Design a protein around this ligand. Structure first.
Ligand code: FAD
Ligand code: FAD
Ligand code: NAP
Ligand code: NAP
Ligand code: CL
Ligand code: CL
Lengths: 444, 448
């Protein structure tokens, strides 16, 4: 029979397994599935580790998530259309859950599906090669439980390895002289390490916003964020300064493009990530900056030069979980021969139309509107449950409004489920005072 | 020549392998085409310092484990090249325990003189090495991070020089997920100043624990705790350094030891050693071993017995370092060039097994560096690598061990004689404990 390799058991790989299991329970014959995951358990980013740098096997540490992390968007925007918050939790819960609560949710769906049996944990993907002679892929992996490098042949491969794990880590003048810690956002674990300290954040996006907010919340003496082009422009607290870009450091001080300088204890590079696929040769390897429309992907998923190779979740994310579902359902239907692909020329013409639109986008609203339209096109082609994308866009609009009103209280707001219409209750504690990140403390 | 060699890495071992070939060429031999792949932007391996930790600018694991303020942990006289002396490089006597930048300068000096930088492709990560039975050649696949290109080339021989002190052994202890302080491996340690006024727990009882603890002490840590798995280090530690039996668990703030004691600690540094990790090799070529004086499956400690066109340099545990890699690289060179015909697989395994049986009996430090000295003597007797006085190096290791026992904080204040030139090292202008500036300029200057 047909054999599929699914690379990774984060949200995307979980979605890909669930997509196949959904087709099976509706009565379809599905291919043999094998999912390779280098971590010891599923959940991808959402599987928290104290580890940084390299794991116990020598593999790069995957997760970038830290203690005290909460949902940075409304949970109502990432709800599964086939497995609601109401089904999983059995009651209304607040709109910005801590990491452990969303990890519990995503695991709940695949626990229900029974798809853990397809997953080989502690197994790092080493190489994927396409064989023209057999029209099959050789997937080579390292099983760290047995310390064995082995290969198997697959008919199709679905890459679900994420793109927020391999850091973009630029050097600044004087880093070799600096007496304090220099780390990337990827390595950040515990805001308590920076209690009573002066922390410099290099960058102006989600990691700078939230790591700065955690350092503030857990008692940093001072936060400095520095921007390359434009300030973040939010209402920062009194002990948070925004500066133009870092120019250089010395033993103790950071020097900014405005000619100012001051003592800093630690530097956190919130400079984003690279798309990194060392297990792919250039015939299969996606090369892209982080963007809403990466190139060479028909419907954002099908590798145009070899359409038996698929990528899930490689777009920049406003939508996250239910985008990966729409993609996984699409990829499943292509694999199962339910969606015949057009010619390479027709695929490229379709992708180019989406690219041309992506190139014009300016505002946050234009961006989540584009991604909503993309997902609508995907769900129109499969049996993934329809959901109210314009209502989700309106929720993103409210969220963006709440961040502008007050960047420290946006998580104190509640939104309505677009799947069930359930209104989220207000949490028992305002975010700034909610020090305990535990599922037990949140659901109490 | 019509054959081509891939050398994986441009640390001391890969530099030695290039120098071995260049030495044969300047003496009038025809040598093979050489290609050396190095993922860093410059040569030196461990000795090339970086502020970076975890993953580098290209997403490759950061290689170097070296830190600010690192000095030679053995006498430089024990690692001197037999073909390129300290006297030749520096033009004067220098003290016996140079800072990192000074030994980096030295190792670079030899390959600068040799002109072998032209063979090296920097910023290039080795991804895969496969042996092809059909052509009896290796396909080496690499990622050139300068151009972001993955390409493959065919090689007749491969010499693996990628080290084994870079991929950390990082065991989890009960409660690590709860602990509110930093947890890092020795591999990630960069700057003792980060621990000034802090209580630092070191897990481990070998060189990394000794030296990282010594740096934390020197640069003003409040307290050092070192914990041992089997036996204490047993040195004369300063008053703010405690030795405990092994860590059992941690909570939010405290470390709990096997003696039933516990105390609040600010940071935990795992000084738990390293793993031999070769993700670019399939199991037919991949060395699997613990850190030891005699890793298995290596004839003369260098020739992969299942495929003797594949070689490993420097994969042994190290008393000897630079001149061991030279002895090995000269041997591998002579096998590649057909100067040393190999015995049958059965004869190679019988020779390796004799060395293994001896290795298994070793107990004392002296038995260990004596074994490694005898190993190196066997290698150098088979090639034109300049003979050097191995018993005199062993005697220097013995003096060094004696100096560490007398006073672990002042062993670096002693001087030894070059076994290559007979030059006596002068006393440094500053005692180690007060020598806060690690720069080559500060070390080679005359002012204290
Ligand atoms: C710090 C951080 C916070 C975030 N917070 C939110 C949030 O609040 N809300 C939200 O909607 N989204 C958030 N995201 C976005 C995040 O990308 C998605 O939520 C989701 O985790 C992406 O799922 P994925 O499966 O595509 O990738 P990942 O979650 O990265 O999972 C990829 C999986 O592939 C495995 N893998 C990778 N390489 C290999 C290999 N070679 N061999 C084997 N296995 C491999 C990994 O170990 C991992 O399990 C956050 C991202 C980051 C980095
Ligand atoms: C912290 C520390 C301190 C030390 N101090 C001393 C000392 O004072 N005295 C002493 O004698 N010895 C010391 N050593 C021992 C050390 O092993 C040797 O000095 C020497 O650096 C070993 O050289 P090598 O070339 O075998 O390996 P390395 O120095 O580790 O060099 C390996 C090279 O391979 C490259 N490489 C690795 N993987 C790849 C890949 N996939 N693709 C491409 N290139 C790759 C690396 O980037 C590097 O250039 C120390 C070791 C450590 C870890
Ligand atoms: N749940 C949470 O609270 C949380 C926390 C952290 C991250 N995340 C998630 O993680 C993902 C990644 O977010 P991210 O902000 O890490 O990455 P990102 O969105 O790709 O942000 C990249 C940032 O790096 C900056 N940058 C790049 N090079 C720079 C340089 N040389 N100097 C200064 N700044 C530089 C960019 O500035 P320019 O704009 O000038 O290019 C930009 O601000 C997102 O999905 C996010 O939601 C979530
Ligand atoms: N120039 C310098 O100053 C400097 C500094 C750092 C390192 N180095 C070099 O780096 C190399 C490696 O030295 P290293 O000490 O890092 O590694 P190493 O010699 O392999 O030592 C490993 C240590 O980890 C301990 N260990 C392993 N697992 C443990 C566990 N679960 N709990 C507690 N302890 C555990 C071992 O204890 P057991 O003995 O009980 O097994 C041993 O003490 C050497 O070449 C060294 O010279 C040099
Ligand atoms: Cl069907
Ligand atoms: Cl000012």
């Amino acid at each position: 029979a047909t054999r599929i390799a699914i690379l990774g058991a984060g949200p995307s790989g979980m979605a890909q397994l669930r997509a196949f299991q959904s087709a099976q329970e509706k009565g379809a014959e599905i291919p043999e599935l094998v999912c390779f995951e280098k971590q010891a358990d599923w959940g991808g980013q959402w599987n928290y580790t104290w580890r940084t740098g390299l794991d116990e096997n020598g593999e790069p540490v995957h997760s970038s998530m830290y203690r005290y992390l909460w949902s940075n968007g409304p949970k109502e925007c990432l709800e599964f259309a086939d497995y609601t918050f109401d089904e999983h939790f059995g009651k209304p819960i607040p709109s910005y859950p801590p990491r452990e609560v969303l990890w519990d949710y995503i695991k709940g769906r695949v626990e229900k599906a029974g798809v853990r049996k397809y997953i080989r944990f502690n197994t790092a993907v080493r190489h994927v090669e396409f064989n023209e002679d057999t029209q099959t892929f050789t997937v080579t992996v390292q099983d760290h439980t047995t310390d064995t490098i082995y290969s198997e042949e697959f008919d199709y491969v679905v890459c679900c390895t994420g793109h927020f794990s391999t850091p973009y880590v630029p050097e600044f003048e004087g880093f070799e002289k600096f007496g304090g810690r220099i780390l990337h956002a990827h390595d950040f674990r515990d805001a308590l390490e920076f209690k009573g300290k002066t922390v410099l954040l290099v960058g102006s996006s989600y990691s700078a916003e939230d790591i700065g907010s955690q350092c503030y919340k857990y008692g940093a003496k001072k936060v400095i964020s520095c921007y390359r082009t434009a300030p973040m422009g939010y209402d920062w607290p009194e002990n948070w300064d925004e500066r133009p870009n870092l120019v250089r450091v010395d033993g103790e001080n950071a020097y900014f493009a405005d000619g100012s300088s001051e003592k800093v204890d630690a530097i956190i590079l919130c400079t984003g990530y690279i798309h990194h696929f060392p297990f792919l040769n250039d015939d299969l390897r996606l090369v892209t900056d982080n963007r809403l429309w990466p190139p060479n992907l028909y419907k954002g998923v099908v590798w145009e030069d070899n359409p038996k190779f698929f990528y899930i979740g490689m777009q920049d994310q406003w939508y996250s979980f239910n985008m990966f579902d729409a993609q996984a359902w699409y990829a499943r239907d292509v694999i199962m021969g339910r969606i015949p692909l057009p010619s390479k020329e027709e695929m490229k013409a379709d992708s180019q139309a989406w690219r041309e639109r992506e190139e014009t986008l300016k505002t946050d609203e234009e961006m989540y509107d584009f991604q909503g339209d993309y997902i609508q096109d995907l769900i129109d082609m499969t049996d993934y449950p329809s959901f109210d994308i314009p209502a989700v866009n309106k929720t993103f609009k409210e969220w963006k409004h709440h961040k502008k009103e007050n960047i420290m209280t946006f998580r104190d707001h509640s939104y309505r489920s677009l799947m069930t219409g359930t209104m989220a209750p207000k949490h028992h504690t305002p975010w700034i005072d909610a020090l305990d990140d535990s599922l037990e403390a949140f659901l109490s």
